[PDB]
Symmetry: D3
Subunit: 216 residues, 6 copies
Amino acid sequence: EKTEVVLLACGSFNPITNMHLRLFELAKDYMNGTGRYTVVKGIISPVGDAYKKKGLIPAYHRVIMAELATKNSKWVEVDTWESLQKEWKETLKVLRHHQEKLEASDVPKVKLLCGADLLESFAVPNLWKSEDITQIVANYGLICVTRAGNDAQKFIYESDVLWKHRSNIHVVNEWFANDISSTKIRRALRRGQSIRYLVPDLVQEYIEKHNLYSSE
Amino acid sequence: EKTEVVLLACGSFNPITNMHLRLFELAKDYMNGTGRYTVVKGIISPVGDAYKKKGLIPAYHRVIMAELATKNSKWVEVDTWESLQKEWKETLKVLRHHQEKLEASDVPKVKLLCGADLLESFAVPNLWKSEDITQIVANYGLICVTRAGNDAQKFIYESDVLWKHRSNIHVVNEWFANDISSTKIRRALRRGQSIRYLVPDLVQEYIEKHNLYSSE
Amino acid sequence: EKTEVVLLACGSFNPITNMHLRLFELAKDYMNGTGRYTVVKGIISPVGDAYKKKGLIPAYHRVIMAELATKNSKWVEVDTWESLQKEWKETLKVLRHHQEKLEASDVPKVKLLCGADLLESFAVPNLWKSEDITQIVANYGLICVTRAGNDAQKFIYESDVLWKHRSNIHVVNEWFANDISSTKIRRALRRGQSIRYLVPDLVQEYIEKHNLYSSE
Amino acid sequence: EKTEVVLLACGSFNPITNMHLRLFELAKDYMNGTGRYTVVKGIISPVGDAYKKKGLIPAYHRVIMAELATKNSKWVEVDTWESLQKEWKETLKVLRHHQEKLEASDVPKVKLLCGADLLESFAVPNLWKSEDITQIVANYGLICVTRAGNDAQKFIYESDVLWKHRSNIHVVNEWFANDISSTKIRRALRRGQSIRYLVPDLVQEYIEKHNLYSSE
Amino acid sequence: EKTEVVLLACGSFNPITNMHLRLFELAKDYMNGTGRYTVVKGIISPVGDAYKKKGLIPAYHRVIMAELATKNSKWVEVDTWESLQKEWKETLKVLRHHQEKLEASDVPKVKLLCGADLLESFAVPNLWKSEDITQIVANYGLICVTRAGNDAQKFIYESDVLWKHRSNIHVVNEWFANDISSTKIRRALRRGQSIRYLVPDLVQEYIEKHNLYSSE
Amino acid sequence: EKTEVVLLACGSFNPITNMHLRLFELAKDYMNGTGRYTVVKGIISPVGDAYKKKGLIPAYHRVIMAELATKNSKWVEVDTWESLQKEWKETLKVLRHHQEKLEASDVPKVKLLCGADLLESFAVPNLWKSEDITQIVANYGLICVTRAGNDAQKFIYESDVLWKHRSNIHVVNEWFANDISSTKIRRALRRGQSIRYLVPDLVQEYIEKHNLYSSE
């Protein structure tokens, strides 16, 4: 009688590393261990080229490396929809897009998989529209996997919009530190350092043959 | 016995309009009317895709429209060098690049063609390195065409680096107002307005068939 | 066959002066001289005590002085609704409130009467929600009476949201300067100066007997 | 031969909670245990309605709840003087007001009862006039009750004005954490949570029957 | 029966130029032409070395050049008092110092001679203490000589403290533009330009023999 | 076969204290205990009077107190060169100055002796020119003695310019806390407190007889 859930992670995956992959396994173990849910699929959805940030490499590369990272996974996949659109899409739209897609196979609920960082982001003074925060939290749900869940709970308590919808945010503890951020990987790469065993062997091979992140 | 000069205009040309084209004819008429120079070629050099700004469309489009804009001109051309490089290039490098290229045909002096806007830019507190300003002004020269030359002269008087090298900056008056900025063209385009007779007929046709700048 | 319009002016009226009264007569003359409208009533609606600004005196005073200011007017009145509510109300709600009230007398269109100041305000970086600006302009309309309509038109041209809905904003010129701002009246009053013949005789009498704005 | 002292606490009491009440008992125990003083009365004096802050409810409510909070206390009382004045009063004036009042009963010294927060406040760059800080500290005295007295002592050491007059500031440790801030109470209340046993039963009853702080 | 006045100009005189000298003759002509005063002496008082600004050269130089500038004047002199003190002195103290000195010759009123610049300065948000502005204006008086008296009057109207004491501020028009600022002189000097006939011949000679302001 | 090194410490020495003296002995012990170097001389070089900071007393005083502080040291000395120059000198020039001086005695390498504070400083957004940081680190070397070497290593890891040249930065731990900053000494002095046994007896005597830092 459990609820069927799909896990959706947006982001830049620039590049993807073991840490993003671990977040999925963590979150599914947790959800399924509530006794209240059954996790049915996960989806990585990298941001597109319209988001014009510096250091952000062409989507097609970031899509590959994510596909390499998940080739053997029974349950997590990459969807290129958002990377394809000609104008940049807001997470709330990416979410609606993926929920409507499931309803069209004639019902599993999508939920946004994030870290605390999202919560921090949500409270930066003018940055988000309260009503957009409300729709995400309230219509979908958050699964916040983090090594600082103690910070996580505090942001929830400090925001009325989050507190109001708290029964729909799940804070998940990571007891095994593995803080392998894209930013550190890129930093290591432009210094010529090894990144072996922080990202999947094939993702490391792709980065090396294409000399990515080596430059600046 | 006059000095041979080449006119180099960097920028985004996003898109090019009658105003940029007029700047060249203005500046050559002036230079050649000093009695001290003979203008020998001009060069438009659009910025590349590494400069990641919002609203800045792919170089290849901006290169086309500039080539359409100058197809009939006896003396002005487009060079795609800077648009091609994989990392963004500073104007001082674009300049050295084009001077060295002339020296390799076995001597004409390149000079940077700009408006006041450049001068304004040069004095923004932390924005430019004094030594880079010095090399441009001093090693190459500026030709500042503007409708406000009165502002132009003032920025020169207010900056030691510019004043020092003033004998190498030529302020050129435009007595015929034709302030057709890219920014206004894009604004008009995303409101569905005509831009006929502010840009060359062929540049207007290209923009229309490709639906550029229509979106946001 | 003309359209019936109601003129609604929100604000603090702190206090009301001849200038606010003149804005109504100006705007009606204009509207009625389009040949396209007939102005049917005007409404002054002072802000409430929830808006807690400094220098803003209790609503009941500001309501009186407005009622004194309009006692003899055939067509302009004061509605205390917004001043009465326990929580501060946004202009878009005040607007909906007054439109729905007319529809309940079984159809005249309300329009917001403002000056340029509103337009300036609309473009301050984070200050307004684009969608709220859109509803006001688009669902109601603006009548902008000003001595600087030249600035007015420019703000319209500079904002996509305003430009989009321009056919619904009427910029009205005042050829008779009478810039009697509340701020100047209060300033004069706390210096003990006369304000006779800048506000209606009765409003001046009320302010004097209650020693308002004399203090700080 | 001990000195007779009166304890004066200014503030918003919005609302009062067990924490403010505890500060008095703490400070008297301390003073009286110096062997150098005898505490003779305390006074809560809520700020007035001229201070126009958001969330700050009408004085009369805040005066009640403080009177309910102290009805059974042998030694602490509420004085409504400052709440009554038509213009907002600075603490230094409230202080002079209360000292002169004692001198008029034909001599006990008033002292300002505060937390560290005051000290933090005193050093914010432009916020206080050095000479006002000097008069308070020097003419009256501070009794700083806090759970962080370690921060307290540091602010004293970091400010010349405070250090100079240190012999007149008493830092009091609270070994029993009871951080029940008004801000947290209001937050709890607008989420419908219990605040029972963080404020006196009667203060809780008043807040509930008047539905205070429930709104926003 | 006229009032006897002394004119005191503080500042950096870095260096002094014809413009400062002209301000005195202007202000005396004006005062004496009121029919209400008789100007009896003027005093230039350069700031000291404690004021540690960049570009500000040692007092002794600035004292010389002022003494050279006034050697032939029947009525204006230099007083080195403020330049001598070991700690920097505020204008209000310099003023009290010079008034008390006159009272000691057994009564002429000192008045501060300034330009608009002072008025501008007086209103910069946190910059001056209202009470210091009050003492200067009110206890001494201002004589504001300027080419923009129209700006002058406006600052007076915009500040309550100034407006209150307006009967004690005299705005003096200069109908002969001679804007020879220290800043422009120094700028000219470090570019090797002539400053002949903008400062007294002897001041120009001193600057030249000591190579002042030539450097940076 | 070890490398011969000279230790150069720039700064204000305002005043010098036991802490600066300890930094030298610390750094030499460390260098010499690498087995790779031999420390041959150290040099304190106080900043000059052109650097016009507030609280910074005349160089000649700061030069004395440093000479008193080192009179008995076999190996550390004061060089007044930089204090003497008429324009303020950048550390990179002070460095080149001292290296060239050694090369002129017909080869020991100078190295900059600093604390973390330098590293913090190096990363403040616009503060240093990357190329100047590069020349110091790369052409000379840093010896960073600190009680927080853990912060030290982190700044190194966070800056590409530092990381690139890390093999040339030596982070030295101080296991004996002795944080006697100039700022604390001056603070103590203007409160009339003892500073005995935080600075050399003779430096303390000089400060006392000249009443330095007593004022403000």
